Amino acid sequence: EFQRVTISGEEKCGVPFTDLLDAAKSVVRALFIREKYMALSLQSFCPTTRRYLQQLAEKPLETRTEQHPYEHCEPSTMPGDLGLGLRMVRGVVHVYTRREPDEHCSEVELPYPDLQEFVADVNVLMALIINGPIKSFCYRRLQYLSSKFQMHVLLNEMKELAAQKKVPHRDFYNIRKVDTHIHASSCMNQKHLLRFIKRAMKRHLEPIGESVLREIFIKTDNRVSGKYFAHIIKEVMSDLEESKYQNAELRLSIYGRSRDEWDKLARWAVMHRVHSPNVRWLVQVPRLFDVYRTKGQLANFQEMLENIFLPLFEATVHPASHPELHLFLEHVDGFDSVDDESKPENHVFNLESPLPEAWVEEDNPPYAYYLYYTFANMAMLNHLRRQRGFHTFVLRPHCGEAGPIHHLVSAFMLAENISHGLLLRKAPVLQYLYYLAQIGIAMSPLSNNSLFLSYHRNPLPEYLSRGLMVSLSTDDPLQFHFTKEPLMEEYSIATQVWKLSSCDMCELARNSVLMSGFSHKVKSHWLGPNYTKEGPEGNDIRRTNVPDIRVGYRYETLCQELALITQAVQSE
Amino acid sequence: EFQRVTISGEEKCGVPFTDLLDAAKSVVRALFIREKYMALSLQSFCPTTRRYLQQLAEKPLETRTQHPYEHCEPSTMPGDLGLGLRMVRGVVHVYTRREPDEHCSEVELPYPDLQEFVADVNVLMALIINGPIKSFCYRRLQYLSSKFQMHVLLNEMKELAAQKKVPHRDFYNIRKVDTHIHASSCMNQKHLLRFIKRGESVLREIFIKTDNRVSGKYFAHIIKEVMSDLEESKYQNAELRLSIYGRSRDEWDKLARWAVMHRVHSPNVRWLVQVPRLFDVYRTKGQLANFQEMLENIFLPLFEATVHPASHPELHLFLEHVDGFDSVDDESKPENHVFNLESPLPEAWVEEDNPPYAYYLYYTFANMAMLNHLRRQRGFHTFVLRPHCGEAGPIHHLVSAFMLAENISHGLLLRKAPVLQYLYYLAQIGIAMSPLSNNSLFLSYHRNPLPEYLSRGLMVSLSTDDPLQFHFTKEPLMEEYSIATQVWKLSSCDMCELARNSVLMSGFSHKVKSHWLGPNYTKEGPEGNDIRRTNVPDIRVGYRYETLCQELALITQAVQSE
Amino acid sequence: EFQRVTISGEEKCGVPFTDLLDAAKSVVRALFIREKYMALSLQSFCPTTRRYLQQLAFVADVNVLMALIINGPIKSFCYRRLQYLSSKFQMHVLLNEMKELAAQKKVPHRDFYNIRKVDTHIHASSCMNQKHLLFAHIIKEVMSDLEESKYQNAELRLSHSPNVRWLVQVPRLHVDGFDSVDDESKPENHVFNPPYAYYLYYTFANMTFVLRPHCGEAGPIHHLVSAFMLAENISHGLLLRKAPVLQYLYYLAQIGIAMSPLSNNSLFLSYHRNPLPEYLSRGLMVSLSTDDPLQFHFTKEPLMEEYSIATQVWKLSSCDMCELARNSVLMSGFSHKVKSHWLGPNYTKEGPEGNDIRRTNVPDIRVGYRYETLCQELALITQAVQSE
Ligand SMILES: CC1(C)CN(C(N)=O)c2ccccc2N1Cc1ccccc1
Ligand SMILES: CC1(C)CN(C(N)=O)c2ccccc2N1Cc1ccccc1
Ligand SMILES: [Zn+2]
Ligand SMILES: [Zn+2]
Ligand SMILES: [Zn+2]
C-alpha cells in the first residue's frame, strides 16, 4: 500500500454544492456526447468513465465492438465481392444492397451521422467552454489534482522506487516505448533526398518542400520514389527492430487529389516489402483543399472526400478490386489531419455551410469540416468492416498545437486520441474533460519549443502530474534532434528539464502503448496478459516497471473525481 | 562586414573614471598574477591579454609562442642524464647528480616561493570582496550581454547566410571534443557489477591491491570500445580522466603498462590524470604517513621517467598521450583550514584532516611546473593543470585556479563572483561545463550560467561529466549539445563556436588541430578562423575579438592615465 | 551630452532591404490610414510621425490592416525592431544611468512629488465605498483630496475641480471625449450585441471630443486594429504584446496607453507578465492609472501606490517614474494653458527642446534618447520607401 491523501470534510470538492452541480451536470452531458460519437465510430471510450456514466445513463452503453504478410498477393484467397453499392450523399458514404443498375438497390441501414445533431452537440460544448462559473470549478479541480500528485510523491516516492529496485530486470532501457506521433516523410535526410532528387532528374534526362513531395506521389509511378522511401523506412524498421523495446507509429500521406493514391501506396508497401512488427501506419489527410481548388485540380470538396474514402469502401466490399489495399489496411489503424493549425479560420462549420458537393469556392473548409466528414465516412467504413471481420479504424488528429481552442471541442467528440494539445492549458473546461475521459495526448515538446511553445512553457509536466494520458513522441526525428535515437533524446530533455522520476518515465512509456494501434496479442506480451484490466490489476511491474502504487493513485484519483461529478448529478 | 555597436563620448565605461581607474589597476594586477604563474608553469596565457599587459609593464613578459604502444625498446629511448631528485618543502628539486660527485648542486629550476603565492592570493582574495570593483565588473558583464543581443539582432542573418555559403560544413562535419569526461564513468554498472562473477572505493583498490590483469583487460575493452565509437564518428573526440590516487608509487607504472599491454590508444582520446583529494581517508587507514608521501607517489615516477626514460619504460610512452592533471572531490565538502604560511607543510601534514583545495592545487602546480621545465629541456611533452573548479563550495576556489590553472571544469560559481567572471573573460580561461550533470545534482538546468558565459564571450565548451549516466542516448556529447541548443534556444554560430572552443581548449597536437581548424588557428581573431572548417562565420569571431580588445583597452587606458 | 549607441554597417535594421521595404510599405500605409481618420474625427495625430509621413505624400482599410497584422514575414521585421528598441534602452541605461540620476539631482527643486501626474483611467462609480453605499458627496472629497494634492490630478469617467476632468463612458451592451467600457473577454461571433468593431465605427467620427476607449484588455486582438484607426488614447493595452505589428505602429504613432498594472493582476493578467515595463523601455507612450481606486489599492494615495508597486516590482529608476508622470500629463485632456504651467510654455516642442527638468524632473538625456530613437526608426521606415 501507500500513503493515501484523504480529503475528509463537507465541501470535499471545495465549492458549494450549488456550484458543483452546475459544472457536474454539464460535464456529464459533455462526457455523454463523446461516448455517443465514439460508439458511432466503433472507437474507444474510457471504461472507468463509462462504468460511472452507466449510473446516470438512460440508455445502455458498453464495449460491444511467420511469412512476410504482403508476400502472398492472391486475390483468390481474399473475401469475395458482396455486390454492394457505394455512393456518397451529403458528404457521408452510403452503402447499398446492389452494385449495378441491373438489380434493385436498397440502402444498408448503417448509423449514418446527422449533421444537425452534430451542430447541436458542438454548440452545447462551445457554450460550456465559456461559462465562468464552470471554468472556475474545472480550474480548481485541475489544481487539486496536481497538489494531490505532489503529496503522493512526497509521501510515497521512495515506496515507488523500492518496488522498482525489486524486479531489477526491468528498466526504462528495456520497457516497451512507442513513438506515438512521427511523420514518415520526415525520416528522410534532406541532404540525401536532394541527392536522390538531383540524380532522378538526370535519370528522366537519360529544402525540398513537402509540396514537391506530394506531387511526386500523385504525378509519378513512384518506381524511383518508392525505392528511396522504401529503403529509408525499412532501415528505420530494422533500427527500431534491433531496439526490441522501441516502436513507431509512422504517418503516411493520402492527399485526396486522385483516387489511385490509396492503390499507389499499397503497391509501395507490397512491392518493396515495407512491414515491421513495430511500425504501425496512420494516414494523414493534409488539409490543402484551398491549394487544390485554386489550381483547378478538384472541383468539389466531395471529390477529395471521395478519392480518400471510396477506395477504402470498395476494398471492404470486393477485396480483389484493390488486392494490395486489402492487405495494406490490416496494418493501417486510422486517419490523421495535418496542416498549419496557426492559420486563421473565417468560416464556422454550421448547418448554414456549403456541403462537400456545394463547396466549390477556393476557400478552405474549417477544421471541424475536415474532421466531421472524416469521422462520418470512417464510422460507416468501420461499421461495414466490422461485419466482415476487418480492421476497425480510428481518428487521431493534430489538435491543439496552435490556432483556436475550439479545435479541441471537435476532437473531444470525434477523436480517440489527439496530438500536441498545447492549448488545453488555456481551457480549464476542456482539460478537465480530457482527464475525466482519459483521452490520449501524444506530445512532442521538442518540436514545440522551436516553433510554438518554449520547453519551459510546455504543459506536458502538468498534464502528466494531473493524470492526463500523456506520451512522448518525436514529431520530426531528424530536424529537432541531434542524436541517432530521437525517441530516447525526447525522453531525456523532458526527464532532465522537468526532473522526472523513473516511475514518471515508465508511466509515459506505458501510456505510449495504451494509446497505440497495436494488437491485443502484442500488447499482452508487451504489458502482460491483463493489460486490458483497468487499475492496479492491469499492471505488472515485471513488464512495465511502473509500481502498482502509482497505478493505484491514478486509478483512485480518477474514480474519486468521476464519483464527485456523478454523485452530484444524483443528489439534485 | 557586420553592424558594429560603438559607444560615443568620454564615460564609455558607464561609471566615474575613479571607479574605472580603481577597478582597472586591480584587474591589471590580477592579470599579471596569472601571467606570472602561467609562464613559470610553461602553461598558456591569452596572447591578446598579454599584448595589452606588455604596454603597462616595465619588463618584457615571459609568455611567448605505427601504433605508439606497439614496441617498447629502452635502448632506443632517450638517455639517462643521472640527475638526482629530492622533494624539499613539497616541491621536487633536481640535483646535478645522485651518486657521489664533485658537487650535487641544485639545478637552477625556477622553484616556487610560497610567501609570494600567499601574498598574491591575499591580494586577489581582497579584490573579489571590494564592492566598488564588484559593481564596476557587474556593469561591464551586463554590457557584454547587451552588446551580444545587438549583434544577433543586427547580424544573425548575415552570420546564417555565411554558414550557408559553405554547405560542406555543418555541426556534424565539424570536429568536437568532449573536454571533461571521466573514463571510469564509461563502464556499465550492471556489466561491471556482474563482472565480479561472484563504489569508487572498490575500483580504487582493484587498481592498487592487485595486478589489474582481469581488471585492466576488462576496463581496457570498455574504453577501447569508446575509442572505436569515436573513430567511426570521426568528428567526436574526448579527453578522458584516469585516476592516480597517490597511495603507492607503482600506480603510474601500473597505468602505463595497462595502456601499453591492452593498447588503449586512439587518435581521438587524449589522457588527463585526476588525483582524487582523499588524503584524510588514506591517513585514517594508515596507508600514507605524511601528505608529502602522496605528492611523492604522484610526481617522483614522472620525474624519474623524465630523467631516466628506461627506468619507467611504458611511462615514457604513456606520457606522450597524457596532457595534464586534474583534481576531483565533492567540492561541496566544507573547508576548515586556510592555506597560509602558518599551515603545515606536506612532510608535516600527519593529521587526519584533508588539506584545503589550494593546498592540493599549489603543490600539484609547483611540482608540475618544475617537471615541465625539465621535460621541455629534454624535448618531452609538457603538462597542464585543469582542475575541477566552481561546481560548488566557496567562491575562493576560483581564485586558486585563476592563478594556477590553464582550464577549469564546471565553473558554476562565477555567476556569484562578478570580478572573477570579468577576469576569466579578459584572461580567456577555458570553462568545460556539463549542464546536464549540474541539473541532477547542484544547479537547475535553466539557472546554469552557460548562456551568460557564452553570450559575454568566455571560452565555454560543452562536455559530458558522466557519459553513461545522465544521458539516455549513446552519443552523449551530442545529447549534451541538444538540450543546451534547445533549452536556451541557440543558433549554429553558438553551437559551432562551442565546438571550436572545445578544440581550442583541448590538449590535442598542433598538427591535428591544424588539420581540424586550419593551418593558422594559432592566429588571434578572425584571421585564425576558416569557415570551411569551423562553420563559424568571421562575423562572430570579429565581434568576439573586437569586444575583448576594446574591453582590454578600457582597462589598459585607465591605468596608463596615471 | 550623453553616451550614444551608434550602429554602423549595412543591415542596420537587421534584415535585407527587400524585407525592410516589404514591411515599410505596409507600415507607411497604415500610418497614413490613421492620420486621415484622426484628421476627420478631430482627434490628435503624432507630430513627429506626421512630419516624416508628409515627405512621402473604412472596411477596406480595415481589411488592409487586418492583413498586415497577420503578414508573418512583416511580423518578423516588427519583432526584430521592437527587440532592438528594448536592447538599445538597456545599453542606454547602463552607460547613462549614472549621469541621468546626477542630472535629476542637479535640480533638487523637482522630485517625484513636485512633478505633475494625471490618473488617466479611473471610474467614478468605483470612488464610492460599497459598504457606505449600503453621489456628489464621494466625488466632492475625491476632488477635494485631489485639490489638497497640489501636484496630483486625475480624469474621471461618468457613465468644477481644476484637477478633475470628465470623459463619459458608454457600455457596449469640461468633458473631453468618450470611452467604450465592457468586459472585453466576451467572445465575438459576428463580424462587422453589436460587436466591438461596431460601436467604435459610429463613435469614431461623430465629433472637440476625442475617443479614448477601453481597448486591449483581453478578447480579440483586432480591437487594437480598430483603436489604431478610431482612437487617440487607449486603456489597458495588454494585447499589443501579442501583436508585434500593432505595437510597432503604436510606438511609431506615439499612441497613448493608459495601463492599470495593479488591477490587471486581479483578473486579466499577472504583475510579472504585465507588458508595461517592456513598453516603457521601447519608448511607447505609457501612463499609470488606477482602474478602481479602492478595490485593488490598500492605501490612501492609490496612484502613488500604483506607481510604487510598478517601481519596486520592475526596479524602475527616478527617470522611469518621472518619465511616466510627464506621459500622463501630455496625453491628458487638458489645455495648452494648463500645460503651459504644469509642464511649461515649451511643452509643445517635441524632443529635448520641450523638456524642462525644473518642471518634469526628467533629464534631457532620456528625452534625447527617446526622440532620437523614434526619429531614426521612422527614417528607416520612410527613407526606405523614398528611394524605392
Ligand atoms: C510523399 C512521399 C514523400 C511519402 N509518401 C506518402 N505516401 O506519404 C510516399 C509513398 C510511396 C512513394 C512515394 C512517397 N512520397 C513521394 C516521394 C518519396 C521519395 C522521394 C521523392 C518523393
Ligand atoms: C579504477 C579503474 C576502474 C580505472 N582505472 C584508473 N586508473 O582509473 C584502471 C586502470 C587500469 C586497470 C584498472 C583500473 N580500474 C579498476 C577496475 C577496472 C575494471 C574493473 C574493476 C576495477
Ligand atoms: Zn506532427
Ligand atoms: Zn567531473
Ligand atoms: Zn476600466
Short mmCIF file of C-alpha atoms in Angstrom, two decimals, chain A residues 99-316:
data_model
loop_
_atom_site.label_atom_id
_atom_site.label_comp_id
_atom_site.label_asym_id
_atom_site.label_seq_id
_atom_site.Cartn_x
_atom_site.Cartn_y
_atom_site.Cartn_z
CA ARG A 99 -23.77 -2.56 -57.04
CA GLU A 100 -25.35 -2.31 -60.51
CA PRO A 101 -28.41 -0.81 -62.22
CA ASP A 102 -29.27 -4.40 -63.20
CA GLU A 103 -30.68 -5.17 -59.73
CA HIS A 104 -32.67 -3.14 -57.23
CA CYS A 105 -30.59 -1.16 -54.74
CA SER A 106 -31.62 -0.73 -51.09
CA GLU A 107 -29.67 1.44 -48.66
CA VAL A 108 -27.93 -0.61 -45.98
CA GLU A 109 -29.21 0.63 -42.61
CA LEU A 110 -25.92 1.89 -41.21
CA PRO A 111 -25.96 4.58 -38.49
CA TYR A 112 -25.35 7.40 -40.94
CA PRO A 113 -24.44 10.57 -39.00
CA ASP A 114 -26.83 13.52 -38.75
CA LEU A 115 -25.10 16.87 -39.21
CA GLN A 116 -27.92 18.70 -37.42
CA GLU A 117 -27.23 16.59 -34.33
CA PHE A 118 -23.51 17.37 -34.58
CA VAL A 119 -24.11 21.11 -34.98
CA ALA A 120 -26.21 20.91 -31.80
CA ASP A 121 -23.75 18.94 -29.66
CA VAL A 122 -20.94 21.28 -30.73
CA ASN A 123 -22.95 24.35 -29.72
CA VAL A 124 -23.68 22.83 -26.30
CA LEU A 125 -19.98 22.13 -25.73
CA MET A 126 -18.97 25.50 -27.18
CA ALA A 127 -21.14 27.16 -24.51
CA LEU A 128 -19.55 25.14 -21.69
CA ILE A 129 -16.04 26.37 -22.56
CA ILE A 130 -17.05 30.00 -21.95
CA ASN A 131 -19.06 29.63 -18.73
CA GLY A 132 -17.10 31.40 -16.00
CA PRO A 133 -18.68 29.57 -13.05
CA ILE A 134 -17.87 26.17 -14.58
CA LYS A 135 -14.48 27.18 -15.99
CA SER A 136 -13.60 28.22 -12.44
CA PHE A 137 -14.66 24.89 -10.94
CA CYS A 138 -12.65 22.92 -13.50
CA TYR A 139 -9.56 25.06 -12.87
CA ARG A 140 -9.82 24.47 -9.11
CA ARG A 141 -10.24 20.71 -9.56
CA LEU A 142 -7.34 20.66 -12.02
CA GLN A 143 -5.17 22.41 -9.43
CA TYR A 144 -6.29 19.92 -6.78
CA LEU A 145 -5.13 17.04 -8.99
CA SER A 146 -1.62 18.48 -9.25
CA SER A 147 -1.48 19.10 -5.49
CA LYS A 148 -2.60 15.52 -4.83
CA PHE A 149 0.23 14.28 -7.05
CA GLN A 150 2.81 16.38 -5.20
CA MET A 151 1.73 14.98 -1.83
CA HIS A 152 1.72 11.46 -3.28
CA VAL A 153 5.33 11.69 -4.47
CA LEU A 154 6.44 13.39 -1.25
CA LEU A 155 4.84 10.69 0.91
CA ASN A 156 5.34 7.71 -1.43
CA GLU A 157 8.22 8.39 -3.86
CA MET A 158 10.59 6.06 -2.01
CA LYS A 159 7.96 3.32 -1.77
CA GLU A 160 7.73 3.50 -5.56
CA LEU A 161 11.48 3.36 -6.17
CA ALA A 162 11.79 0.42 -3.76
CA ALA A 163 9.32 -1.52 -5.91
CA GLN A 164 11.35 -0.61 -8.99
CA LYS A 165 14.52 -1.78 -7.23
CA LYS A 166 12.74 -5.09 -6.83
CA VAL A 167 12.14 -6.69 -10.21
CA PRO A 168 15.61 -5.46 -11.28
CA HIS A 169 15.39 -7.00 -14.76
CA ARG A 170 13.00 -4.27 -15.96
CA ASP A 171 14.42 -0.79 -16.56
CA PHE A 172 13.49 2.16 -18.76
CA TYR A 173 16.02 0.83 -21.29
CA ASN A 174 14.08 -2.45 -21.69
CA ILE A 175 10.45 -1.31 -21.27
CA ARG A 176 8.19 -1.01 -24.30
CA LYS A 177 8.19 2.52 -25.73
CA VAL A 178 6.01 3.59 -28.67
CA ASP A 179 6.64 6.76 -30.65
CA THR A 180 3.02 7.89 -30.89
CA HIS A 181 3.45 10.75 -33.38
CA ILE A 182 6.19 10.55 -36.03
CA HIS A 183 5.84 11.63 -39.67
CA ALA A 184 7.35 9.13 -42.10
CA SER A 185 8.25 11.77 -44.70
CA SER A 186 10.42 13.41 -42.03
CA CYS A 187 12.51 10.21 -41.72
CA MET A 188 14.41 11.34 -44.85
CA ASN A 189 17.76 13.13 -44.85
CA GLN A 190 17.16 16.45 -46.60
CA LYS A 191 20.74 16.35 -47.89
CA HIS A 192 20.43 12.77 -49.14
CA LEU A 193 16.94 13.35 -50.54
CA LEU A 194 18.16 16.23 -52.70
CA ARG A 195 20.97 13.96 -53.91
CA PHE A 196 18.43 11.33 -54.95
CA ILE A 197 16.17 14.00 -56.45
CA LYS A 198 19.05 15.52 -58.43
CA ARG A 199 20.05 12.16 -59.90
CA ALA A 200 16.45 11.23 -60.72
CA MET A 201 16.03 14.36 -62.84
CA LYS A 202 19.04 13.24 -64.88
CA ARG A 203 17.53 9.74 -64.94
CA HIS A 204 14.49 11.25 -66.66
CA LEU A 205 17.07 13.06 -68.84
CA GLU A 206 18.66 9.76 -69.92
CA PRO A 207 14.93 22.43 -48.87
CA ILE A 208 12.75 20.07 -50.92
CA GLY A 209 9.27 21.12 -49.86
CA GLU A 210 6.50 18.82 -48.74
CA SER A 211 4.56 20.17 -51.73
CA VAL A 212 7.13 18.90 -54.25
CA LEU A 213 6.92 15.56 -52.44
CA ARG A 214 3.12 15.42 -52.69
CA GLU A 215 3.10 15.92 -56.46
CA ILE A 216 5.63 13.12 -56.99
CA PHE A 217 3.41 10.65 -55.13
CA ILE A 218 0.41 11.89 -57.16
CA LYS A 219 2.04 12.51 -60.58
CA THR A 220 4.63 9.71 -60.78
CA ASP A 221 4.72 5.92 -60.93
CA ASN A 222 6.72 6.00 -57.66
CA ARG A 223 9.13 3.46 -59.17
CA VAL A 224 12.10 5.63 -58.18
CA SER A 225 10.40 7.43 -55.28
CA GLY A 226 9.02 4.19 -53.87
CA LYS A 227 12.50 2.68 -53.62
CA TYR A 228 14.21 5.63 -51.93
CA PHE A 229 11.32 5.93 -49.46
CA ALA A 230 11.23 2.14 -49.02
CA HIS A 231 14.88 1.68 -48.03
CA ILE A 232 14.75 4.63 -45.62
CA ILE A 233 11.65 3.39 -43.79
CA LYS A 234 12.89 -0.20 -43.91
CA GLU A 235 16.17 0.89 -42.32
CA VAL A 236 14.09 2.71 -39.69
CA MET A 237 12.13 -0.54 -39.37
CA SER A 238 15.35 -2.51 -38.87
CA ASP A 239 16.82 0.03 -36.44
CA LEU A 240 13.54 0.02 -34.50
CA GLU A 241 13.69 -3.80 -34.55
CA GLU A 242 17.19 -4.08 -33.07
CA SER A 243 15.86 -1.89 -30.24
CA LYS A 244 13.31 -4.57 -29.38
CA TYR A 245 11.50 -2.22 -27.00
CA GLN A 246 11.16 0.87 -29.24
CA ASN A 247 8.26 1.01 -31.70
CA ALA A 248 6.94 3.68 -34.06
CA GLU A 249 3.55 4.80 -35.41
CA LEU A 250 4.58 6.41 -38.68
CA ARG A 251 2.31 8.80 -40.57
CA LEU A 252 1.80 8.36 -44.32
CA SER A 253 0.18 10.95 -46.57
CA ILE A 254 -3.01 10.45 -48.59
CA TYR A 255 -3.79 13.81 -50.16
CA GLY A 256 -7.12 13.08 -51.84
CA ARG A 257 -6.11 14.64 -55.16
CA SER A 258 -6.68 11.37 -57.06
CA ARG A 259 -8.49 8.09 -56.48
CA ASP A 260 -5.42 5.98 -57.35
CA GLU A 261 -3.43 7.25 -54.36
CA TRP A 262 -4.54 4.50 -51.97
CA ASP A 263 -3.75 1.88 -54.62
CA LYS A 264 -0.44 3.59 -55.37
CA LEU A 265 0.50 3.47 -51.68
CA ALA A 266 -0.45 -0.18 -51.12
CA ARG A 267 1.82 -1.19 -54.01
CA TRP A 268 4.80 0.58 -52.43
CA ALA A 269 4.20 -1.33 -49.20
CA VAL A 270 3.83 -4.66 -51.02
CA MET A 271 6.29 -4.20 -53.91
CA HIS A 272 9.13 -3.05 -51.64
CA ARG A 273 8.05 -5.23 -48.69
CA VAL A 274 7.61 -2.44 -46.15
CA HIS A 275 6.33 -4.14 -42.99
CA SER A 276 7.70 -4.28 -39.46
CA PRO A 277 6.25 -5.78 -36.26
CA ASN A 278 6.95 -2.42 -34.59
CA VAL A 279 5.74 0.02 -37.28
CA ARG A 280 2.02 0.80 -37.45
CA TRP A 281 0.66 3.12 -40.13
CA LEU A 282 -1.67 6.06 -39.62
CA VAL A 283 -2.66 8.02 -42.72
CA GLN A 284 -2.67 11.83 -42.67
CA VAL A 285 -5.03 13.87 -44.85
CA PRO A 286 -3.21 17.20 -45.46
CA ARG A 287 -5.86 19.95 -45.29
CA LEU A 288 -4.79 21.56 -48.57
CA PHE A 289 -8.09 21.83 -50.45
CA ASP A 290 -7.66 25.59 -50.86
CA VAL A 291 -4.50 24.96 -52.89
CA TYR A 292 -6.00 22.16 -54.99
CA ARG A 293 -9.18 24.04 -55.95
CA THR A 294 -7.28 27.24 -56.77
CA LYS A 295 -5.22 25.10 -59.18
CA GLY A 296 -8.35 23.60 -60.76
CA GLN A 297 -7.33 20.12 -59.61
CA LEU A 298 -10.51 19.37 -57.63
CA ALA A 299 -13.97 20.68 -58.46
CA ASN A 300 -15.66 19.85 -55.14
CA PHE A 301 -14.55 19.06 -51.63
CA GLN A 302 -16.68 15.94 -52.12
CA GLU A 303 -14.18 14.85 -54.78
CA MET A 304 -11.45 14.86 -52.13
CA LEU A 305 -13.76 13.13 -49.65
CA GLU A 306 -14.42 10.54 -52.37
CA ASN A 307 -10.83 9.97 -53.51
CA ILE A 308 -9.89 9.30 -49.86
CA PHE A 309 -12.78 7.21 -48.50
CA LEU A 310 -14.16 5.38 -51.56
CA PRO A 311 -11.09 3.23 -52.37
CA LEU A 312 -11.39 2.03 -48.77
CA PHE A 313 -15.10 1.19 -49.01
CA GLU A 314 -14.54 -0.60 -52.32
CA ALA A 315 -11.86 -2.87 -50.85
CA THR A 316 -14.11 -3.67 -47.88
#
